[PDB]
Write a protein that binds this ligand. Structure first.
Ligand SMILES: [Fe+3]
Ligand SMILES: [Fe+3]
Ligand SMILES: [Fe+3]
Ligand SMILES: [Fe+3]
Lengths: 200, 238, 200, 238, 200, 238, 200
């Protein structure tokens, strides 16, 4: 068969991943420009929402040293790929859970609908990669919303999951933190209620 | 018009199959008994047609759709793709690549094919494509099946796809047969064995290419072709 | 010594080369544009001629499944490589003998004189490549014209054939097929009167 | 009735594939976490059905005619033959062999198969037969095609035919897969790799059998199956 | 040591086992004679019962593609091996759980008592083989009855299971379905309440 | 009458010697130039004579006594025995085995042999035998000596015995030559070199068999013959 | 693939074949029972015919050391396999050409029609196997009759020979030898008019 060059293998991000990728959160001085957790400036279009969550390991204990990267469409269903601190909206950002702060937070907008390769609309979703010590190769997941019950029933990706109980682990619960619309999404790495993770 | 600004590397006649290969029965009365006369390359042999402006139908390289009288053909859906380079490793852009093959059961769509495996009403078996600027071509088709033939009393051709490649000149033009990785009929066929060196056989073998497969859809084979090397004339007539 | 990548080996065109290469002649549907046996349209400049011939195997029996490719200069002695069905003249064509039609035909113009690489004129000729079942690597030959005797006598290619009697095997015989000037050329793959074939 | 007069060689669970082989993803949730409980062989485990008088239809072993809708299936015509013996080399006569497979495109005839390769109107995919006195069976069929499945993002099963063999007791019954000689998908499949020893993998590969082929008609493959060795009891209870 | 020919290795029955082995259940046309789930015609001796159960994977979710083979003594404790659709009773049968019916069913008679090879009586039992996608080598288990507590306590096969709580997973619950005595036997492949499986 | 119920495995024409093997000179003008035409097997090719009722004389297989003019032949007294089986290993019973050879000095009893080694007045050089129920045959004779011939200027045939075997059909019939283990003339004989593969040559070399020797009397050689395998027809004409 | 045991290789029958297979011809004393050239006894049913021929090498010279075995059906189309010198007809026989006799003869009856495996009738034929010095493995051929032109034109064997002129080499010419009905069958091993030889 045709063999290509093999991919550089993955290794864990290590406990001190915050030092190279979350300098603020590592409590170290920042540089002029940092890729962080505020995707939408105050005047960006769409519905401004706050996202928060905790990450749990297989014994039920909080993982306090994780790092998360996100990739989402803006409010019109468009991937804004040209990263810039001056854009009203960047489709990419990063957050982290630390000892001080067991919870990660992300400020953004509710994304519009994008079609999959076959032309079928997928439900609004945020793509997440999770990294941490003990995690050898990062975990992919998707944050879906509970107020989009209809678009979620038809999502061709959420329908690829066989067991209806497993689809629910992907659905963030609407709540409110300081008057601001907020969704909570907890990730359970192993065990009971284990979050579904993808491969692509 | 075409100009004599090129020379082509001389063919290695012991790498290609000979003209007389008696196990391939039909070669016996169809092979010259006199020696071939060598002639120096002139503009007549170092030039050839360029098919850039031939008007290809939209489906010419797609055998899952270019015959189609109702549906889809039955058989393993597969992309056969590769690159056409000359012996210096230089891509051959804008060359014509024609192919034809049997159906998944080894029945060919010609009047004289009387084998008992049926015709497939959705399958024709011919395709053509022009390589791109980088020398790549690709077809989508179904993997043909082996078929029996009146050579020895129990001879079966391995699953193959015939290929015709023009190249830049009538000197580079070549007709060949692509075979598939691992087919255990390959070492027994008398037509494959017209080739004497087992390393030359290997070059007719298409490799499974999982990287080019479309998941949940079709697998891919990789077949690269190598035409006579081409060079600029140097120090001729002084 | 210096070894290049080896050339992909040749294989026989096989019995059904008509399905991929002469669609009509295989009695199967054709595509909009087919490379065929009419090199000159009625208004092409030059002497319009009809070429025909048969192909015999080593026992004297007709070869009914061959496929042939020709390459020739226009009437000015110029090779026209930009193939196009809209040109009044193309330098390339294909024709075939089949069960029903034991004979091939070509409609074209008598080519003009071209020089060899040393600047010596060659007589008017058509370059032919023959393919068929039983033929492991195609055979190259040239068609010369019997009304070009004085030019034929001096061609540097035809003077490389050591024995005069073999030169004759390359000379097509002038005749008339329904008021049109025609040249018959029979190829004898093996045996008595074996057609001279070239290597280059 | 059935009598307890035999013992069967204990199975090697390191030769057979283990229960938990995570790359075959469906085995994660369907494998037991507790150890199997070993019990001695009694008449419940050393007897089993004998299907000698099951009434077989005339074409139950022939898949080219058992699903006839006025035509012949499209695909490579093959005979799949072989011999069923126990580990001592003794033939297993009048045993039931059952088989099922995809069509030549990899499409299976079941409501849940939604792969896009079309169903074939003349091909059902199921067959059955009883081994003769000497332990031989044979089926006629079309070579099935590979097919993708949702395991990894680009997994493809190799062409295979599923087998079910009864043997003389429930202690011998076995379900397996036959694979085809030389098929390059074989070493990449997580199901075939549920077997750890490469020598056990070989035992599932059917070999091209030119000797059983019907010239001008169909090729043949040979698959011999070995069931657990059977022996008389000795010195038991004293 | 003496090595004998190695046994052909097992492979999963795969998802579509129904096609070769449960035709009706795969919604395909059947042949004249099928091996199915009715082991006792109405005029057969013994007590007629209905057996039914479901299969669970290790997440608590139903297995809708299983295939089960059974083997049992008749009401007199005799194993009837000559299989035949005209006998009033056959000791073998097959059943399945499909997407339509998540529950398999079997109609038969309560088996009589057979002795083990040492001459000790075994309690009435049914021998079960389970096969499905995800099961690389089939799982053997035995179904005993809750109304035979006396004989179940002396069973020399049930007493090989060390822990008493584990013996309970093999005892089917007597109930009633349409005024017919039935026993329900559910199989848990993995996890809490995991069914005991054997090796012999 | 004979009935068409068997098929014979097609002959491997690359294992047997080719027709044109120019070092063997007489083969140049006695070999066909056109290809053999392949024909399916019918009752004409799959049946053949049976020689059970032929009337064998009592010393037909015993060349030490079958010619006899008043004594014993001069030469190494030997038994040549072996078994005739088919390509499946199945014995071939009641078949006809014929043989003929030179005497101890290499002279053959035919008018045209003008070789100067004398004739032996007690030796004829011919034997026949029918195989037994298990396929065994056996003859007793003296070991032939090598002889020169008119091929190359110093060619010498290794010691050999010509054998002819009928088998169950005309499709199986074969004429061959036995050679003796260790003979240094075997690799230089052009007739033996007509067999291109060295492994096929080994099959004609009879091996010394001390186990079958009669002590104080004669040595023995073992020579097993393998005829085309035979199988029952299956799935033909449907 | 599956490899069976290889067939013993063929070797030429040699110049002295007559000594083991044609005793009289070698001019040696015969045994009581010999396999020879009189297939039919004077009272066997069917049409009595004398066959004869000569064997040529590729230089046009007679082969005077050839040996031939024949196999043919009787007048009703049946193969008589039990060979016995007392039978009226035996389907097998042998003959030979020698220095003395350059020509072989065979006394038999014209074979009736038999079917191929596909139920299609063959024209009447005699199966011939030719052996000699210089032939490494024996040549198979078929003798057909010129006076059976309707059956010959439909024989499914004679129609597998592609070229018509090659079919004629198998058709023996009716003539008269001593006033008796005869068919002459000359064999040409090599060269002009080479006899078709088969592989099966
Ligand atoms: Fe570190
Ligand atoms: Fe082909
Ligand atoms: Fe499968
Ligand atoms: Fe000899």
């Amino acid at each position: 068969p045709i063999e290509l060059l093999p991919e550089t293998p993955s290794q864990t991000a290590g406990p001190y991943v915050h030092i190279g990728l979350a300098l603020e959160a590592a409590g170290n001085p920042t540089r002029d420009q940092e890729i962080w957790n505020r995707l939408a400036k105050p005047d960006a279009p769409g519905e401004h929402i706050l996202l928060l969550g905790q990450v749990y390991d297989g014994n039920g204990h909080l993982v306090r040293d994780s790092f998360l990267e996100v990739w989402q469409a803006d409010a019109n269903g468009e991937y804004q790929d040209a990263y810039n601190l001056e854009n009203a909206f960047n489709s990419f950002g990063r957050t982290a859970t630390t000892f001080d702060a067991g919870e990660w937070t992300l400020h953004t907008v509710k994304p519009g609908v994008v079609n999959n390769a076959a032309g079928v609309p997928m439900a609004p979703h945020i793509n997440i990669s999770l990294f941490a010590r003990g995690i050898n190769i990062h975990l992919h997941t998707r944050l879906y919303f509970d107020d989009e019950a209809q678009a979620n029933a038809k999502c061709p990706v959420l329908n690829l999951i066989e067991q209806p109980q497993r689809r629910e682990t992907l659905i963030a619960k609407r709540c409110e933190v300081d008057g601001k619309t907020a969704y909570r999404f907890d990730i359970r790495i192993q065990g009971e209620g284990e979050t579904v993770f993808f491969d692509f | 018009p075409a100009q004599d600004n090129s020379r082509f590397v001389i063919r290695d006649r012991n790498w290609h199959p000979k003209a007389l290969t008696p196990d391939y029965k039909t070669s016996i009365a169809r092979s010259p008994r006199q020696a071939l006369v060598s002639i120096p390359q002139s503009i007549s042999e170092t030039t050839g047609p360029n098919f850039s402006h031939l008007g290809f139908g939209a489906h010419d390289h797609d055998l899952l759709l270019n015959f189609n009288n109702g549906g889809l053909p039955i058989g393993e859906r597969i992309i056969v793709a590769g690159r056409v380079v000359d012996q210096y490793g230089k891509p051959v852009p804008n060359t014509l690549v024609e192919m034809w093959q049997a159906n998944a059961g080894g029945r060919e769509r010609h009047k004289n094919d009387r084998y008992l495996a049926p015709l497939d009403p959705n399958f024709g078996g011919v395709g053509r494509c022009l390589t791109d600027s980088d020398g790549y071509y690709s077809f989508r088709t179904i993997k043909p099946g082996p078929y029996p033939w009146r050579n020895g009393p129990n001879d079966w051709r391995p699953a193959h796809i015939h290929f015709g490649i023009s190249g830049p000149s009538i000197a580079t033009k070549l007709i060949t047969q692509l075979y598939f990785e691992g087919d255990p009929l390959i070492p027994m066929c008398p037509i494959v064995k017209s080739i004497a060196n087992p390393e030359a056989v290997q070059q007719l073998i298409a490799k499974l290419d999982m990287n080019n497969a479309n998941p949940m859809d079709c697998l891919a084979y990789r077949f690269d072709i190598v035409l006579r090397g081409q060079r600029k004339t140097h120090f001729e007539n002084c």
